Structures are given as C-alpha cells and as structure tokens.
C-alpha cells in the first residue's frame, strides 16, 4: 500500500553518498576544460541519417535583489530587458527566450497598457517566450524550508495561470549554490516532467560526465519504487555564462558571446574577442563553434544538445538583442546548409529541448541512469566550498522561519470564513506571501546580498509580519465572539500578538506588559492558537505588572501557573562583566495552555493582593564571585548568591541535567535509575586565512580547526520553578540559556558577535556516542539524509546545511539538535555535533558581491536538545541513505517552528467572548500535518474553494504503543461541501475527483494537496 521508507534500500545507478565514498576529489588541470579533460569525438558519429540537433536557448539571469534591491534592479535593468524582449520576439518570430523569476515578470506586466499585454500573451501563446519553473524566485535550496519553496512556487505559478494561462512543466535552477532533492520532490508533485541544475561540485561534474550520467532520473533517497523520480539535466561546466556553455573551451566559447566586442564594456578574459560573422568568415567561425558543440554532445546520451545563451541581466539593450540574434542567425544559416557538419541548429526553449530528448529516448536511442542523493556542499574551484552561506546574516535566517509560521497561521485563521472586501484580508495575505516568497531568493535567505539590500529584505519581512498580525487578530476576534454580537472595525486592534522568541529578549524590547491592578482592571483575556492538527499542550508566558496573578480557563477552572522575574543581560562596561538585571516593574507568568487541533483556547489572568492559591514562584540563584544584590520590585522571593559551582536540575518527571561551574551543560540523566550521560556544550571560534583565499558571505575558508572561546569566570543565573527552570550564562558574544519544562531542554542563544572581525562563532556538543564518521542533517525541513565526514575533504567541505535539525547516533544512543533557524554545521569528530552561530568577515570572497559581512546584529537562536535511547528503534540498515526522527524529536522541531500563537485582548472588556474554537476538529496522527490551509476564492464566488496541503513525515518505531487518533478528512472541515478534489501541490490542476467528497490521508514521507468546494 504505502511503500516502506525504512527497511528497503533503493537500488539506483548513482547514489551520491556512495559516490562520494569512492571518488577522489583531486583538483587536476584538465587543459582548456580546466576541471575536466580533453574531450574527443568520432567525426563519423553524426551523418545524414543521424544529425546533431542543437537548441540555442537565450536567457537572462535576473536576481530579485543582490548588488541592488529588487526595485533598483527592476528600474535599472529588468524593465528594459523585458520591454526589449517583448519588442524583439514580437518582430522576430524564430527568436526564443526563457524567463524564470515571476516576481519581476508580475512587477513588469502590471505596468503594461492593454495593447502590450495582448502582445505579450501572443508571444507566450506561440511559444517564443517560455516560462521556466514559474516560481516567484529561483529559491535557495540549502536554507529554505520546503513549505516556503512550495509557497513561492505556488505564488508564481498561480500568477502565470491567471494572467498568462500557462503552467511550466520544466524547471531551470542555474544559480543556487548546490542543489537539493526537495526540488524534484515538490516539482514532481506539481506537474513537472523535467528540471535542470548547474552549481554542483566540479569533481561531481567530471565524474558524471565521464559516465554520461549528467542526465538522470532523480528519485528521493528512500524511494524503492521510483514514483518520485524526475528527469534532471545537470549542466557540465563551471558556469552558466556563454564562455562556459557552448563547449569545453571558454577561450573559444567567449568568441560567440557577441556582447563582448567593446561597445558594451565587456570583453573576453582569454584575450580573443568575438568577431562579427560575415560571408568571409562564417565557414571558419562555424567550424570552431560546431567542434565545441560536438565535444559538449559527447558528455550526453542523445543526439539533442542544449546550448544556453545568456548571463546576468542580459538582453537589456536593443543593440544587444540585434548583435546576438543576427550573428547566430548567420551561423545557423551556414551550418544547417552544410551537410558535412550533420547539424541542425536553431533557437529553442527549455521545454523544446526536453521534448526532443524524450522523443529520442522513446525512439530507443538512450536510457537514463537513476540517481538519489543531494549536491551539497558545492565547490566551484580548488578548496572554495560554499558552506559560509549556510550561516551568513543569521538574523534574517531566523526571521525567515518566524515569518514562515505567521504566514501559515494568518492564512489558516482567516480561511475559516469568507471576508468582505473591505476587511482587506486578501490584500494583506498576498503582500505577506510575496515578501516571504521574495526572501527565498538565493541572495535573500542565503545572506549573500549587499548591506542595503539585506536591509530592504528585512523591512519587507517586517511589513509582512505586520500584515499577518492584522489578519490573525481580526480572525481571532471573529472566531471567538458570539455571532449576533460581533461588530468589527477592520482597521482596529482587538488583540496584540505576544511572541517570546522574536525578535527575542535582548534583541528588541517589543512585548507588551499586561497591566492589571485592584484599582483599575482586575483581569485580562489571552487567547492561544494552535496551527497543528492535533490537541496540543505547551507552556506559554506573558509579561504582567504584578507577580500576584492567577490563571483560569473558559469555565473558570484554575490553571497552575508559575511566576518568574524578567531577566535581561547587559554588557556592564563599568564592572567588565556580562551580567543579568531583574525587572522591578514587570514579571513573567507561565502556564500550560491546552488548545484544540487548528484551534483556539481562551484563558483569563486575574490580579490579587497576595500569593494566589494556584501560582508558585521560582527561586533564583546568581553564581559569581563578588556578588551584589539584585532587587526585583514586588517579586516575593529574594535572589540567592553563591560562588560558581556545578549544579543539577530536574523539572517534573523529565530528565536531570547537570551543569559545569561555567553554566554549560555537562550531562543528562534520562530516568531516576539511568546513567548521567556526558553531553558537553562548548563555544569555539574560527578565524580567516591571512594569506590566499578569504572567507566571505559565500565561502567558509577557516584558518584551521576552531579554538575554544576563553570564558573567564562567567556569571551564571539559575532559576528553579515547578513548571520551568533554567540556567543562563553570559559568555563573550553569547548569552547561553538552557531551559527545562520537563522534557527535552530548549536552548536559546543571544548572539552578538560585536566587533569581532574575521571570526565565526560555533556551538559544539561533545558526547561519548560512538558515531564514527556518520551524522545526519535535514534538507529543507523535509527529510534527514545520512552524511559521512571525509578526511579526504577539507573541514569546510564537511559542513552541510542544518535547515531544521541534525543528529548522531550509535547502537544505543542518539543526540538530536533541532533548530528554529537554518545554520551551517557538521560532526568533525566522533560523538560531536556543531553549528555555526554567526560570522563577521572583513574581506570579500571574490564572487561579485564586493563586500564582506560586517552588518551583524544581535540574534536570538533557538534549539531543542533531545537525548534518546534508540537500541529499541527500528532503524534503516547500514547502507540506507536516510534517517528518521523519533516522536519526541519531531514534536520538539514543531515546538520551535510552529509554536502556539498568543494574543492579548487590547481593550478593557471583550463583550461576547467565547472560550474555544475547534474543539470538534479531528485530532490527527502525530506524524500528519496540515502544512497549508488557504481559502482560494474571494467572497463574491458562488462556489467557495479551500486548499489544503497535507504532509505525513515518517517517525521511528521505538515501541511506544501510542494508539488512538481520528482520521483527518480536510474536505469536511468546512460545511456545505459539494466536491473534494486531489490537486497538484500548487492547487492549479485537479488530479482526482474524490468519492464521498472524502480526502484520504497520505503515506509516510508523502505530501498531497486537496481542494474542497462549498456552495455559498
Ligand atoms: C488556456 O489554455 C489552453 C491552451 O492550450 C486553451 O485550451 C484555453 O483556451 C486557454 N484559454 C485562453 C486562450 O485564454
Ligand atoms: O550571488 C550571485 C548572484 O545570485 C548572481 S551569481 C554571480 C556569482 C556569485 C553567485 C551568484
Ligand atoms: Zn543569481
């Protein structure tokens, strides 16, 4: 029924971890093809019965922000390229052009008059202008979450279907810095038939070219059957520019980039400029170019050859369109008319190329290899590994994950109703989706844009967060107010959001204190939202003006709560310590919220004059030599002081954690009877090389293994409470906090690298787990892939993306670190895990950015740390390329990426308030998520439609019976259902009309989309 994703190792032609194990990686000079070899061909391979069919595919790589902002590029470059594309294609019917970035195409199209819109649709209809991929952007594939990869794909393709009436089935990804199999996973479930990639390690390109394995059916690592497989073309050479696209010799290919003769600035660095093609030289030029094409064709299996023709922000000047087009037309005319070449060459599009390849395949002329695995970590040359951008600009990496969740919550909360146009819900959600989609660009989330461009992306994401807040709080007001009493002003703030972890404590003082008093306002309603489709309990905290506060639920049942001081840390440059101060004016109340699946739950905070019956107070202990007092206003318990010492803590039934005298974890004891397992946090720094190649925003080029941060005698703050305890320490550049609520701890790091030029700060965990050279990291928050540390590769090559988690295990024990933000990381030695916190780099790394990374700001990084016995778990065999999380680790990841949302009622009194929403929603099996809920129609449509994306992970069976559980049928979540369809993941094509209007659940590791239709 469902394929087993654990126990059957797929049999594939190329399995990338296996290939890595066997391959050499020596960087030897291949000749004119620097990283390959001198390609030879048999001139008699091609003849009158067997011609080489060559498709020259004009293109223009438009970065939505990099050296300039989106809007600066649009004004200076892209509006011209697209205006001239329209003119030239229209006037030249055989000319073709491919277009990837829909964010720019949409920006342009809505500035066009109707006549030009009509002309534009005509060049799309007739195939001359062809969209490739059709995403809002060409996303990063390392740091991006799969949910946002799908978001930005859907944003661009919904635009194309509405305005152009097209949906691309061929994808073009020429610039992301290394490639992820999450792309064919999403694309193949979104109707795609083919895809193309470019930036893979030069040794891999050489290895696959030698075997003609550059075109392959790329399946997921756990896919035994092959149903996930998507035909993929990997380009063979160092760049997608013209010098590295016509064949192996860039000195020759540069002469066929006709923008490089002088009048455009540009030139050929190999010293031979292009010449205008004339009757006098066409035969000689043709002979040179065809010889390049024939050599490139030797690396592939069919007689159909792809020759991209383009570069960054190309096809801008009218004169550039003419000079490319006319010169190639003369080449084509001569080549195609000379039989001795046995070539037929023409401008083509990407789809035209793939269609012709598969016609060749179907004719029996080639069969393709199967492949699984990924293409990280990329190197473009020598030891230049692009692992730096797994961490660059980590404030915005964390902001990506915050905005991902607020997009989801805002679309889901507002989906339950149709809204009047005057509410502007659709407006706000479209802006939020588009600013988040823009940030998925491979210069956005990657942290590889110029300083002012990163500022542009940040301001855009702040506006998106505000839009999501506006929508969420209007929605909560409606969902929780008796229908006959509900009286909305759509511009008013009924609730403010309270978020404990963004921008985070010591990043921005942004949270509102709930002000209560016996003489003023005795109580306050707070509301929690749970986006996940199962009942959820989680501790939530709020700031309040009195410690004397108790909590009740909708039915006035008392709820156990804990009050703690509000602690902030300060780099005290009188005493030269980093140390905490307690607030004397506000306090934190903490309690367990229990919230329906995809639902809401309301609680009340009420002040009293003295300690309430159901509220406890944390003790606090400051460990430092030479202490001074720490007053806390009305807080009832005096802080205690002690010299630095080892301490140990236990919340609830959960683990016991032991801490060193510098306030870092040293051990974890799972059960009262079990061993204290050594687990040691440590902070270290990497430097930059003085001589030769420098780290910058892309490249990680450390000057040797990391050295320990010298900690001195740090101040340690210990807070012990019934519900929540912690240990926090002020270390140089990092306030490090371990938080305990009774299961796996939460780690928070407030990271301020300050003015530490040329430093990368890393957090390492040291254990006795005998992991050897193996470790696991995730790809896009979707799947965990086995990594093997290789000593044949330098340190920076053994760094991988950690977009949401990493783990190490042996026969008996696993340690999993789950993240709230994508960062770079590795396991550099047996029993270790490490993940980079921030990097500040005073040199440029010579990729075109023209600056280092000197714009660091304080960022709050969050994690969960899960130590587990796994000898009872059913794991994949030794040769399997995947790993899987346990239930606890998967729940821990969900607690970071999609926590409960908190709302504080903004006025004194909420008339018509209700206690709960969604108590009748089905509570689905823990491995199932409703990744997206989105209403797809505006309020005037007779037939309302709501789309759902359902994702089932695969969790290890470790012998918890864990039973129960209602079937989730998303099609019956809203009333008056009339149809239920399974669709592509973008919602743009119906794939199956479903019996009884019931949406089935999906298999482990599968993602499906459903659209329910409702008469209204
Ligand atoms: C939309 O797509 C297809 C093109 O193959 C066509 O059948 C349909 O008429 C199109 N609608 C138009 C022309 O807007
Ligand atoms: O970040 C840039 C940008 O996306 C265009 S491309 C230019 C070379 C360096 C990597 C890529
Ligand atoms: Zn780019």
Swiss-Prot record:
Q: Which UniProt keywords apply?
A: Disulfide bond, Glycosidase, Golgi apparatus, Hydrolase, Membrane, Metal-binding, Signal-anchor, Transmembrane, Transmembrane helix, Zinc
Q: How does the protein's chain sit in the membrane according to the entry?
A: Single-pass type II membrane protein
Name its cellular compartments: Golgi apparatus membrane
> Native species of this protein?
Drosophila melanogaster (Fruit fly)
**Active-site feature positions:** 175
> Which Pfam families would you find in this protein's record?
Alpha-mann_mid, Glyc_hyd_38C_2, Glyco_hydro_38C, Glyco_hydro_38N, Laman-like_dom
Induction is noted as: Inhibited by swainsonine and by copper sulfate.
What protein am I looking at? Alpha-mannosidase 2
* Cellular-component GO terms for this entry: endoplasmic reticulum; Golgi membrane; Golgi stack
The upper taxonomy is: Eukaryota, Metazoa, Ecdysozoa, Arthropoda, Hexapoda
